[PDB]
Amino acid sequence: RRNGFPEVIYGAGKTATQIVGIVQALSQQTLPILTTRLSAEKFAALQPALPTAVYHATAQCMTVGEQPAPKTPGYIAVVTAGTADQPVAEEAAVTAETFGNRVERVYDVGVAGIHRLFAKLDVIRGARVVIVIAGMEGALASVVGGLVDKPVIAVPTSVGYGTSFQGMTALLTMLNSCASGITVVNIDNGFGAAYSASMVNQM
Amino acid sequence: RRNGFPEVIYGAGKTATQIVGIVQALSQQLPILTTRLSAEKFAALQPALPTAVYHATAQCMTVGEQPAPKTPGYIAVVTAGTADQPVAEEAAVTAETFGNRVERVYDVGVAGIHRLFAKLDVIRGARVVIVIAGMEGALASVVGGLVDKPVIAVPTSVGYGTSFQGMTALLTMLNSCASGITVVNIDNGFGAAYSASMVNQM
Amino acid sequence: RRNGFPEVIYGAGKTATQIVGIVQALSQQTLPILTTRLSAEKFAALQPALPTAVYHATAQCMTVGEQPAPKTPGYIAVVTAGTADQPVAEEAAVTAETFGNRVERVYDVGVAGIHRLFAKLDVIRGARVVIVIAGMEGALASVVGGLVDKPVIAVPTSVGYGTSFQGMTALLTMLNSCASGITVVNIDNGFGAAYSASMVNQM
Amino acid sequence: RRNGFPEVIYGAGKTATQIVGIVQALSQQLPILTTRLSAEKFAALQPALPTAVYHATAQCMTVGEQPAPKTPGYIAVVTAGTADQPVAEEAAVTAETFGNRVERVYDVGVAGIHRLFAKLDVIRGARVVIVIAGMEGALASVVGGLVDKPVIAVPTSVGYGTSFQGMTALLTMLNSCASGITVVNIDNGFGAAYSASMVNQM
Amino acid sequence: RRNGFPEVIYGAGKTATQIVGIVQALSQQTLPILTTRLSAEKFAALQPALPTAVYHATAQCMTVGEQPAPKTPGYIAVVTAGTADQPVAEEAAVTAETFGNRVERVYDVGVAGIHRLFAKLDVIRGARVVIVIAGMEGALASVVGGLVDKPVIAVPTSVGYGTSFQGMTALLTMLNSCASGITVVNIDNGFGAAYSASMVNQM
Amino acid sequence: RRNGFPEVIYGAGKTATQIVGIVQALSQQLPILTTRLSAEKFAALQPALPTAVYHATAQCMTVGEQPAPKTPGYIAVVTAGTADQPVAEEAAVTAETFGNRVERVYDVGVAGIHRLFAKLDVIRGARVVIVIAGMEGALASVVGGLVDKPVIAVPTSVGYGTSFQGMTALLTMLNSCASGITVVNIDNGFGAAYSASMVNQM
Amino acid sequence: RRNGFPEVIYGAGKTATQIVGIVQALSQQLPILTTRLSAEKFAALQPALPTAVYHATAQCMTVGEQPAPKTPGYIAVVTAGTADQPVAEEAAVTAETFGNRVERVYDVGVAGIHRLFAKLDVIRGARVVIVIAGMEGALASVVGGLVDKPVIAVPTSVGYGTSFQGMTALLTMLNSCASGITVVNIDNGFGAAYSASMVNQM
Amino acid sequence: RRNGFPEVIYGAGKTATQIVGIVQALSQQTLPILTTRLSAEKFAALQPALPTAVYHATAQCMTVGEQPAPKTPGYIAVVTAGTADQPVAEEAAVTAETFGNRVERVYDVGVAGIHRLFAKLDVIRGARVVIVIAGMEGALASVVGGLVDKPVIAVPTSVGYGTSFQGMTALLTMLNSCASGITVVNIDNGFGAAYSASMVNQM
Ligand SMILES: Nc1ncnc2c1ncn2[C@@H]1O[C@H](COP(=O)(O)OP(=O)(O)OC[C@H]2O[C@@H]([n+]3cccc(C(=O)O)c3)[C@H](O)[C@@H]2O)[C@@H](O)[C@H]1O
Ligand SMILES: Nc1ncnc2c1ncn2[C@@H]1O[C@H](COP(=O)(O)OP(=O)(O)OC[C@H]2O[C@@H]([n+]3cccc(C(=O)O)c3)[C@H](O)[C@@H]2O)[C@@H](O)[C@H]1O
Ligand SMILES: Nc1ncnc2c1ncn2[C@@H]1O[C@H](COP(=O)(O)OP(=O)(O)OC[C@H]2O[C@@H]([n+]3cccc(C(=O)O)c3)[C@H](O)[C@@H]2O)[C@@H](O)[C@H]1O
Ligand SMILES: Nc1ncnc2c1ncn2[C@@H]1O[C@H](COP(=O)(O)OP(=O)(O)OC[C@H]2O[C@@H]([n+]3cccc(C(=O)O)c3)[C@H](O)[C@@H]2O)[C@@H](O)[C@H]1O
Ligand SMILES: [Mg+2]
Ligand SMILES: [Mg+2]
Ligand SMILES: [Mg+2]
Ligand SMILES: [Mg+2]
Ligand SMILES: [Mg+2]
Ligand SMILES: [Mg+2]
Ligand SMILES: [Mg+2]
Ligand SMILES: [Mg+2]
Ligand SMILES: [Mg+2]
Ligand SMILES: [Mg+2]
Ligand SMILES: [Mg+2]
Ligand SMILES: [Mg+2]
Ligand SMILES: [Mg+2]
Ligand SMILES: [Mg+2]
Ligand SMILES: [Mg+2]
Ligand SMILES: [Mg+2]
C-alpha cells in the first residue's frame, strides 16, 4: 500500500500449485514477494513455473523480486545461540533484507562458550535492533538484553529434545528475562521478529 | 548511566525502608521510578520522601520533577477493559518517567469495537503502540492488523477459570506476532514501556 | 428416528472396508448418510463399492443420498479466518447442508485484514446462526460475537505451529470471549458445531 | 438497544458505588441485571437501590419488575449436584431476566442416574437445555445423547485435586460436542443463558 | 512362582528377534506366555520361529500356551464405550482369559446411545468385576460406577482428536468420578486393569 | 440399600446444620459416615449428635456403634510418610465403618526402605492393600511389585513446587499399574477404601 | 550413622513441640539441623533449646556448636538476585552444618553480568558450585559454561505470572545439563547442599 | 584445553556430512572425539570418510580416538531400571568411559522385581558416583538414593506410553525424591549425567 512492506505468503498451509497461483496473481502488483516456510520439495515444483524465484535453502524462504538496497542508515543484528537455530535465523535475515534492512549475522555465540559473544559484542551493540534467536535454555536472550541498550526481540526456537518442549522452555525463559528491554515473539517465528525489527530499524 | 535512562527500583521484594535507602544512595542519579509499590508500603514511605509522587492505580512512585519529554512523538497505551488499567498505568507512568509522551486509549476491547475505530487516528499517529488486554487477548490482533507501527502486547492476569491468570491472553498475543506485534511477560507494563521508550527515542 | 437427522459415520476409527459394511447396512434405512474425517485414500477404496457416493475433498466428507432441499426460512453463516481453516469449514458446511440448511460461506476474513470482515458483515448479520472457524489466535470469534446479535458457535482449529498447540490457544481464546453470545466446540469439530447450528436454525 | 436485551453489569471488578452509578445512568434502559455481586457489596448497595432484588445463591441483582416472559417456551437448567447451584442460579436468573421461562432440574448427576430419567420429560420439553456440572463432566454427555435439542454445557470449578477448578469438567464437555452439545467458559452461567436466550427467542 | 500368573512380555521395547529369544528361554518353564503390544509385522517375524503362537490381531497380543480353563466361579465384564476402544478392550480380555478368567464382552455401549447400556445391564451387574474402557469424554465409567455394586476398573484410551489429548481427558474424567467404587489405570493399559481384575475375580 | 453399605455424607460442601439434618432423616439407615468434616464444623455439630464419634486426623464422623467386622480378612493401609496420615486415616476409618478389618502400616516410605520390609508380612497377609503417598509416588511401585494382591494407590497433595499438590504422585502411580496397582483421585482415601471394601468382602 | 552426616529434621510438617521431642531423643546424635522452620514456630521453640541457633533468612535451626570444617575445599553458593537469598542461605547453612566451607557469591545475575566475572575467581576455585536462581534460570547456563567443576542448579519459586513458582527456572536449568550442570527440586537448597557436601568430601 | 575433557559433537542437529567436516577439523587437535545422538544411517555415511571411527549401536554414539585408560581409583555405577533404558544407559557409559572413568553396569533392576537390585547392591554401593536411569514411574532413583551414601545422578528417559509423557513423569518423580542425595538431569540426557559423574569421579 502506502507502506513499502512486501507481500508475504505463508507457504505452509498452501500447496506448491496454490503458491504459483498466489505468486502469479501478485506478480503484476509491486514490491517483492516473500514466501516463508516453503519446503525444498515445494520449490522444485515452483522452479519451472517461477523461473525468477530465488530459494534460500536454510531459511526455507523464497523471494521473487530484486532485493531492495538498504533503505536506513543502520543495521539489524541477528544473533544466534547455536547452529541448530540457523534455519529460523536465516528466515529472519532474509525477511529483514527483503524489507530493505542491512543485516549483521552473529551466529553461534551461545552461553556454553560465552567468550564468542563478547568477541562480537561490538557488532551487536552497534546495531539499531538486535534479534536474539535461541532454543533449549534460551538463556542467551537474557545475557544479550543486559549487555545492549537497544531494542531486543527474542525468538524461541523448537530445537532440542526432552524438556525443551518444542520451544516452550525457551519461550518461557525469554519472557521471564523482558533484564529489561527484551520483547518476545512466538516459537520459530523469525519472520515476525524481523517484521517488527524492520519497523524499528526504519524509523 | 551513559544511556539516559532513569534509575528503576523493583519495589516488590523490598520494604519501605529498603526503598528509601536506595533513593538516598541514588540522590546523584535524573528521576527515580519505583514499580510495584503497594499503598501500605508507600504510606510508610511518604514521610521519608516528601517530594515523591505516588500513582495509586499504577502502583508506581516517582522521585523528581520530570523535565520536558525527550522526543516529540508519543507512545499509545491501549487497553481492552478497565480491569487492565493498573498495568496500563504502570506502562504509562513508566513511559512518561523515561521522557516519552503518552496518549492513553483505554477500554476499547473488541466486545464494543466501535470504540476502537473512534480512537484509531490517535493510535495510528503513535510512534509505538502498547496494547494491554486480558482474558481473550484479541485486542492485540485487531490493533496489530490495523497499524503499521511496532506493537508491543502486554497480557494481564485479569480473570479466573480458563484465563489462567493471563496465560491465555499471552498465548493469543504470541500467535499474532506475524502482524507488527511483539510480546512481553504477563502484567509487565514496565518492560513494555521500557522497550517502547527505546523505539520511540531513536 | 422421529427426527430428520441423518446417520453419521465417524470414518476415522473405521477402515475403508468397515465403512462399506456400515454404509451398506444403513443404505436400506432412510435419510442420507454422512461420513466425516474420511481420507482421500479411503474414498478410493469406496468408489467401486459405493458408486453413488459423493466425496468433498476439502471437507474430507462423504455423502450418500440426495442432499435435502433447504427446510427452514433462514441460513447459517460459516465464517472463516483464513484459508487453512477451509477443511474444517467445509466439514461444517457439508454437515449443515446434509442436515437441510442453507449455508452462506464467508471465508478468509481474519482480523489481520479486518476490512474484509465488514465487507461481508451484512451477510453474517443476516444469518440465523453464525459458525466462526479460526486457528492460531482465534481472535475472530470475539470480534464476530460483539458485532452480531445471533447465536455464534466457535470452532477452534489445529492449524498453526509453535504456541498454537494444535488448537489449544484458539480454544482458550474463544472460551474466554463466551463478548457474550459465543459458544464453543472441541478443536477441529466443524461437524459438532453444524449439528448444533442445524438445531438452532431449524426451530 | 435495538435487540431487546436488558443491560448487563459485570459487578465483579466494580465497587458498590460504581454499580449504583451505572444504574442511575441507565435509568432510561428495561431491567438491569448485575452478575457476580457479593453479599458484602450488595449490603453497601441495598440502601441505594431500594427497589432492587438480590438473589443470594446466584450472586445476581435485578433492577426492575420483570414483565411477562417473551416466549412461551422454556429453558431447562440442569445440574449434576447441589454444589453447582450458584452458577446454575446465575444462569437461571439471567435467563429469566432476559424474558425466558426457566425450569430448574437440579441435582441429577449420573451417580444416581435414576433422578435424571424421572425428570427427562421436563428436559426434553425444553427449547434449550443448559447442563451444569463439575468434577466429572459426565452429565453433559448423558443429556446430550438423550435430547434432540441444543445443549449448552457449563463446567463449574467445584472440587480440588484433579478437577483443576473446572478444567477437567470443561475438557469432558468439549469432547461430547458430537452430540447436541456446545460449551462455555468455566462457571459462565451468564454466557450460557445469554446464548440460550437467543436460541429460545427466535 | 507359587502364584499361577503367566509370564508377560512387553513386546513394545523389544524387537521381534529379542522376543523369540525371550519366548524360547521361558518356553521351558511353566504356565502360558502372554506378549502385549506386539505389532502385526512383529508376529510375522515370529510365526516361523514360534509356530505354536496365537496372535489376536485386534488386541495386538500373542499367546503361546494352552489357554487355561476358567478357574473361578464368576466372570469379568469388559465394557466398552465405542468400537475404537476395541483394541485395548481385547488386550484386557485376552489378558483376563490368559489368567484363567471368564470374560463377558459388553462392547459399544457409550452414553451417546445409553439405551444400549441398559439392555446389557443384567450382564454387567452379574460380573464380579467390571472393566470399563472408554476414550474422549470417558463418561461411561461414571455412569457404570453408579449403576453397579461391584469393583469397577476404568481404562482411559488414547482414541480421539483435539482436546482428547491422547487419553488425558478420559483419564481425568474417570479419576474424578472414583460415583464411588471406580478405580483407574494408566491410558491404554488394558493389561494392567485385567491383571487387577483377575486378582479380584480369583479371590 | 440392598448392598449392605452404610450411608455416606460428603460433609465438605455442607454446613454443620445440613449434616445434622441428613443424619436425622437417616435415622432408619446401619452406621452413618461423614467424610471431610472440619473440626470447626464438628464443634457446631457435637451438641446435636451426642452419640457421634469424631476422628480428628481423618476429618471423619461416625454415627452409630459399629458391629463386628463382616469379614475375617483385613485391608492394609500403607503410607510413605506421616504427612499422609490424614488421608490414610480417612481411608482407614472408612474401611472400618464399612465393616472391614484394617491394619495400619504407616510411615514406610522408600527413603528408609528397611521399615517396609519389616512390615512386609503384615502387608502380604492383607486381602487388599491401599498404598498412600505424596511427592514421589514410589511407594506404590515398590509395594505393587512385592505383593500379589490388589493394590489401590492413593496420591496425596502433600508438598509444594514440582509435587503439584499430588499431580506428580498421581502420575507416578498410574505408571506402575502394570503391577497389581490401580489408582484413585488425589487425596481420595474414601474412594480407595470403598473399592477396597468391595474386593475384601466378596 | 556410619556416614558422618548430622541428623536432619524436616520441620515444616512438624509443630514446635514435635521438633523439641525429636531433638531430645537425638541428644546422642553430631549437630542437629532443622530446615524449613518458621519464626513463629521457632519462637515457641526458643525457650526449649536454649543452645539453639536460628538463621532467620535460611529458616534453619542448628543444635550444637559446629566443629571445624571436615575438608579444606569450599562450596560456592551463587545467586542471581537478592530474592533467592532464603533458599541460598538454606543451602549455605546446610553445607556448613555438614562440615563444608562455604563462600557466598550472591546477587550476580546476568542482568548485570559484570558482577559475575568480578567473582569468577572465587567460583572457579570452589570444589562444587551451587547456582540458585528464579524467573529466568539463565545464571546456571552461564556458570555451567564457565566452570569445569560440578554445578548443582537450584530453581527458586520467586515471581508471578509465567515464572510459575519456579517451573520456568527449573526447565531452563534442566536444558543446560549438557554443561557441568545437575538440577534439584524447586527451592530445595538443602538437597543441593546435601549432594554438594558428598562431592566436596570425597 | 587445560582440562582433559574430550570434544563432544551433538550429531542430532548436524548432517552426516557436516559431522565429517567437524570431525576432520578437530582430528588434528588432541584427546578423543565423542559424538552423541548419531543415527545408525549417519554412521554408514561416516564409515568411508572416518574409517577409524567406532560406533556403539545401542548408545547411538561414535568415538574416534583410543579410549583413555581409567584415570581415577574408582568406578561409576550406571544403574538401569529396564531394558528399554539401555540406549541412554549406554550413552552415559560410553561418555563416562570416553572421559576416562571405569564404569560398572547394573542393568534391569527396576522395582517391579526389586530383589535384582539388592543382589547387585554391593556393586552400586562401591561406586563413587551412581547414575540411575529409569523411565515411566522412575521410582528406582528414590529407592537407590535412600540406599547409597554416594552422589546419585538421576536420568529420566522418554520410554513408555500414555501418562509417561515422553519422560515428564519420570522427571517429576525423580526431582521429588532430591530421599536426599539425588540430583537430576534433563530427559534422556545420559551424556550430561556422565559429564557430571566424571567430574565427581575425577576429584
Ligand atoms: N547429548 C547432548 N544433549 C544436549 N547437549 C549436548 C549433548 N552432547 C553435547 N551437548 C552439548 O550441547 C552444546 C550445543 O551443541 P551444538 O553441537 O554446538 O549444537 P548448537 O546449534 O550450538 O545448539 C543446539 C541448541 O542448543 C541451544 N543453546 C545452546 C547453548 C546455549 C544456549 C543459550 O540459550 O545461550 C542455547 C541453541 O539455541 C540451539 O537451539 C554443545 O557444546 C555440546 O557439547
Ligand atoms: N512465518 C509466518 N508465520 C505466521 N504467520 C505468517 C508468517 N508469514 C506471514 N504470516 C502471515 O500470517 C497471515 C495468515 O497467513 P495466510 O497465508 O493468509 O494463511 P491463513 O489461512 O489466512 O491463516 C492461517 C491460520 O491463521 C489464523 N488466523 C489468522 C489471522 C487472524 C485470525 C483470527 O483469529 O482472526 C486467525 C487462521 O484461523 C488460520 O488458522 C498472513 O497475512 C501472513 O502474512
Ligand atoms: N466429526 C466427529 N467427531 C467426533 N464425533 C463424531 C463426529 N462425527 C460423528 N461423531 C459421532 O461420535 C460418535 C462415536 O463415533 P463412532 O462411529 O460410533 O466410533 P466409537 O468407537 O463408537 O467412538 C470413538 C470414541 O468415542 C468415545 N466415546 C463415545 C461416546 C461416549 C463415550 C463415553 O465416554 O460414554 C465415549 C469412545 O470411548 C471411543 O474412544 C458417533 O455417534 C458419531 O455420530
Ligand atoms: N501392557 C503393559 N504396559 C506396561 N507394562 C507392562 C505391560 N505388560 C507387562 N508390563 C510389565 O512392565 C514391566 C516392564 O516391562 P519389560 O519387558 O521388563 O521392559 P523394561 O525395560 O524392563 O521396562 C520399560 C520401562 O519401564 C520402566 N520401569 C519399569 C519398572 C520399574 C521402574 C522403576 O522406576 O523402578 C521403571 C523402565 O525404566 C523402562 O523405561 C514388565 O514386568 C511387564 O510385565
Ligand atoms: Mg553449536
Ligand atoms: Mg536492554
Ligand atoms: Mg469495558
Ligand atoms: Mg502491525
Ligand atoms: Mg489467508
Ligand atoms: Mg452476540
Ligand atoms: Mg447430590
Ligand atoms: Mg444432542
Ligand atoms: Mg461406535
Ligand atoms: Mg459402585
Ligand atoms: Mg517419615
Ligand atoms: Mg502387584
Ligand atoms: Mg539484584
Ligand atoms: Mg560446566
Ligand atoms: Mg525389563
Ligand atoms: Mg543418599
PDB file of N, CA and C in Angstrom, chain A residues 9-48:
ATOM      1  N   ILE A   9       3.716 -14.527   1.665  1.00  0.00           N
ATOM      2  CA  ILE A   9       2.948 -15.758   1.515  1.00  0.00           C
ATOM      3  C   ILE A   9       3.374 -16.740   2.599  1.00  0.00           C
ATOM      4  N   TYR A  10       2.394 -17.282   3.319  1.00  0.00           N
ATOM      5  CA  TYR A  10       2.616 -18.333   4.311  1.00  0.00           C
ATOM      6  C   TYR A  10       2.517 -19.670   3.589  1.00  0.00           C
ATOM      7  N   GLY A  11       3.638 -20.123   3.031  1.00  0.00           N
ATOM      8  CA  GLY A  11       3.607 -21.289   2.166  1.00  0.00           C
ATOM      9  C   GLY A  11       3.470 -22.613   2.889  1.00  0.00           C
ATOM     10  N   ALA A  12       3.050 -22.567   4.154  1.00  0.00           N
ATOM     11  CA  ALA A  12       2.864 -23.796   4.914  1.00  0.00           C
ATOM     12  C   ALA A  12       1.500 -24.411   4.631  1.00  0.00           C
ATOM     13  N   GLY A  13       0.431 -23.632   4.791  1.00  0.00           N
ATOM     14  CA  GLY A  13      -0.897 -24.140   4.526  1.00  0.00           C
ATOM     15  C   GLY A  13      -1.317 -24.121   3.077  1.00  0.00           C
ATOM     16  N   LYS A  14      -0.403 -23.799   2.165  1.00  0.00           N
ATOM     17  CA  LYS A  14      -0.690 -23.758   0.742  1.00  0.00           C
ATOM     18  C   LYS A  14       0.180 -24.783   0.029  1.00  0.00           C
ATOM     19  N   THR A  15      -0.347 -25.345  -1.051  1.00  0.00           N
ATOM     20  CA  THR A  15       0.415 -26.306  -1.831  1.00  0.00           C
ATOM     21  C   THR A  15       1.243 -25.575  -2.884  1.00  0.00           C
ATOM     22  N   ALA A  16       2.218 -26.293  -3.451  1.00  0.00           N
ATOM     23  CA  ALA A  16       3.121 -25.684  -4.423  1.00  0.00           C
ATOM     24  C   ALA A  16       2.370 -25.107  -5.618  1.00  0.00           C
ATOM     25  N   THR A  17       1.218 -25.687  -5.963  1.00  0.00           N
ATOM     26  CA  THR A  17       0.417 -25.153  -7.060  1.00  0.00           C
ATOM     27  C   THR A  17      -0.367 -23.922  -6.617  1.00  0.00           C
ATOM     28  N   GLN A  18      -0.933 -23.956  -5.407  1.00  0.00           N
ATOM     29  CA  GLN A  18      -1.625 -22.785  -4.874  1.00  0.00           C
ATOM     30  C   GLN A  18      -0.686 -21.590  -4.800  1.00  0.00           C
ATOM     31  N   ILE A  19       0.572 -21.832  -4.429  1.00  0.00           N
ATOM     32  CA  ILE A  19       1.544 -20.751  -4.305  1.00  0.00           C
ATOM     33  C   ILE A  19       1.832 -20.127  -5.665  1.00  0.00           C
ATOM     34  N   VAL A  20       1.965 -20.951  -6.706  1.00  0.00           N
ATOM     35  CA  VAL A  20       2.202 -20.404  -8.037  1.00  0.00           C
ATOM     36  C   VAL A  20       1.030 -19.536  -8.471  1.00  0.00           C
ATOM     37  N   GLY A  21      -0.189 -19.903  -8.071  1.00  0.00           N
ATOM     38  CA  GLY A  21      -1.337 -19.063  -8.372  1.00  0.00           C
ATOM     39  C   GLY A  21      -1.337 -17.778  -7.568  1.00  0.00           C
ATOM     40  N   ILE A  22      -0.949 -17.859  -6.293  1.00  0.00           N
ATOM     41  CA  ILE A  22      -0.872 -16.658  -5.469  1.00  0.00           C
ATOM     42  C   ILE A  22       0.270 -15.765  -5.938  1.00  0.00           C
ATOM     43  N   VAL A  23       1.389 -16.366  -6.347  1.00  0.00           N
ATOM     44  CA  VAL A  23       2.537 -15.583  -6.797  1.00  0.00           C
ATOM     45  C   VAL A  23       2.241 -14.918  -8.135  1.00  0.00           C
ATOM     46  N   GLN A  24       1.693 -15.682  -9.084  1.00  0.00           N
ATOM     47  CA  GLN A  24       1.424 -15.129 -10.407  1.00  0.00           C
ATOM     48  C   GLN A  24       0.382 -14.019 -10.354  1.00  0.00           C
ATOM     49  N   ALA A  25      -0.561 -14.099  -9.411  1.00  0.00           N
ATOM     50  CA  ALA A  25      -1.562 -13.044  -9.289  1.00  0.00           C
ATOM     51  C   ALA A  25      -0.956 -11.759  -8.740  1.00  0.00           C
ATOM     52  N   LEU A  26      -0.005 -11.872  -7.813  1.00  0.00           N
ATOM     53  CA  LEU A  26       0.616 -10.689  -7.234  1.00  0.00           C
ATOM     54  C   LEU A  26       1.903 -10.290  -7.942  1.00  0.00           C
ATOM     55  N   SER A  27       2.292 -10.998  -9.002  1.00  0.00           N
ATOM     56  CA  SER A  27       3.476 -10.614  -9.758  1.00  0.00           C
ATOM     57  C   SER A  27       3.210  -9.459 -10.712  1.00  0.00           C
ATOM     58  N   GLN A  28       1.964  -9.001 -10.812  1.00  0.00           N
ATOM     59  CA  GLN A  28       1.614  -7.823 -11.594  1.00  0.00           C
ATOM     60  C   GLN A  28       1.406  -6.596 -10.721  1.00  0.00           C
ATOM     61  N   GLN A  29       1.559  -6.737  -9.405  1.00  0.00           N
ATOM     62  CA  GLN A  29       1.467  -5.611  -8.487  1.00  0.00           C
ATOM     63  C   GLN A  29       2.820  -4.922  -8.393  1.00  0.00           C
ATOM     64  N   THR A  30       3.266  -4.647  -7.172  1.00  0.00           N
ATOM     65  CA  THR A  30       4.557  -4.006  -6.972  1.00  0.00           C
ATOM     66  C   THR A  30       5.340  -4.706  -5.872  1.00  0.00           C
ATOM     67  N   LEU A  31       6.503  -4.146  -5.540  1.00  0.00           N
ATOM     68  CA  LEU A  31       7.399  -4.583  -4.477  1.00  0.00           C
ATOM     69  C   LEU A  31       7.947  -5.986  -4.749  1.00  0.00           C
ATOM     70  N   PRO A  32       8.623  -6.609  -3.786  1.00  0.00           N
ATOM     71  CA  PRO A  32       8.984  -8.027  -3.905  1.00  0.00           C
ATOM     72  C   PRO A  32       7.971  -8.945  -3.226  1.00  0.00           C
ATOM     73  N   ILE A  33       8.098 -10.233  -3.535  1.00  0.00           N
ATOM     74  CA  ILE A  33       7.245 -11.266  -2.960  1.00  0.00           C
ATOM     75  C   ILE A  33       8.120 -12.169  -2.102  1.00  0.00           C
ATOM     76  N   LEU A  34       7.757 -12.297  -0.829  1.00  0.00           N
ATOM     77  CA  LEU A  34       8.443 -13.161   0.123  1.00  0.00           C
ATOM     78  C   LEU A  34       7.518 -14.307   0.500  1.00  0.00           C
ATOM     79  N   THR A  35       8.038 -15.530   0.477  1.00  0.00           N
ATOM     80  CA  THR A  35       7.266 -16.704   0.864  1.00  0.00           C
ATOM     81  C   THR A  35       8.039 -17.469   1.926  1.00  0.00           C
ATOM     82  N   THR A  36       7.440 -17.626   3.100  1.00  0.00           N
ATOM     83  CA  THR A  36       8.089 -18.279   4.226  1.00  0.00           C
ATOM     84  C   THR A  36       7.584 -19.708   4.383  1.00  0.00           C
ATOM     85  N   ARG A  37       8.391 -20.517   5.068  1.00  0.00           N
ATOM     86  CA  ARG A  37       8.078 -21.908   5.397  1.00  0.00           C
ATOM     87  C   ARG A  37       7.690 -22.665   4.128  1.00  0.00           C
ATOM     88  N   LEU A  38       8.594 -22.618   3.160  1.00  0.00           N
ATOM     89  CA  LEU A  38       8.382 -23.195   1.841  1.00  0.00           C
ATOM     90  C   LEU A  38       9.362 -24.354   1.721  1.00  0.00           C
ATOM     91  N   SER A  39       8.835 -25.579   1.698  1.00  0.00           N
ATOM     92  CA  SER A  39       9.685 -26.759   1.708  1.00  0.00           C
ATOM     93  C   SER A  39      10.550 -26.823   0.452  1.00  0.00           C
ATOM     94  N   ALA A  40      11.654 -27.566   0.565  1.00  0.00           N
ATOM     95  CA  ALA A  40      12.567 -27.721  -0.562  1.00  0.00           C
ATOM     96  C   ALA A  40      11.916 -28.480  -1.712  1.00  0.00           C
ATOM     97  N   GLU A  41      11.031 -29.431  -1.407  1.00  0.00           N
ATOM     98  CA  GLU A  41      10.302 -30.116  -2.467  1.00  0.00           C
ATOM     99  C   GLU A  41       9.306 -29.185  -3.145  1.00  0.00           C
ATOM    100  N   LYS A  42       8.757 -28.218  -2.401  1.00  0.00           N
ATOM    101  CA  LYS A  42       7.801 -27.284  -2.985  1.00  0.00           C
ATOM    102  C   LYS A  42       8.467 -26.324  -3.961  1.00  0.00           C
ATOM    103  N   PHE A  43       9.706 -25.915  -3.687  1.00  0.00           N
ATOM    104  CA  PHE A  43      10.393 -25.030  -4.619  1.00  0.00           C
ATOM    105  C   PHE A  43      10.743 -25.753  -5.912  1.00  0.00           C
ATOM    106  N   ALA A  44      10.936 -27.075  -5.852  1.00  0.00           N
ATOM    107  CA  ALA A  44      11.164 -27.840  -7.073  1.00  0.00           C
ATOM    108  C   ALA A  44       9.960 -27.740  -8.000  1.00  0.00           C
ATOM    109  N   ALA A  45       8.752 -27.838  -7.438  1.00  0.00           N
ATOM    110  CA  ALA A  45       7.532 -27.661  -8.216  1.00  0.00           C
ATOM    111  C   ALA A  45       7.354 -26.215  -8.658  1.00  0.00           C
ATOM    112  N   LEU A  46       8.102 -25.290  -8.057  1.00  0.00           N
ATOM    113  CA  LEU A  46       7.994 -23.865  -8.339  1.00  0.00           C
ATOM    114  C   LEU A  46       8.996 -23.397  -9.384  1.00  0.00           C
ATOM    115  N   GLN A  47      10.148 -24.063  -9.478  1.00  0.00           N
ATOM    116  CA  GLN A  47      11.216 -23.592 -10.358  1.00  0.00           C
ATOM    117  C   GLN A  47      10.810 -23.485 -11.825  1.00  0.00           C
ATOM    118  N   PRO A  48      10.064 -24.429 -12.421  1.00  0.00           N
ATOM    119  CA  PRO A  48       9.612 -24.213 -13.802  1.00  0.00           C
ATOM    120  C   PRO A  48       8.618 -23.065 -13.922  1.00  0.00           C
TER     121      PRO A  48
END
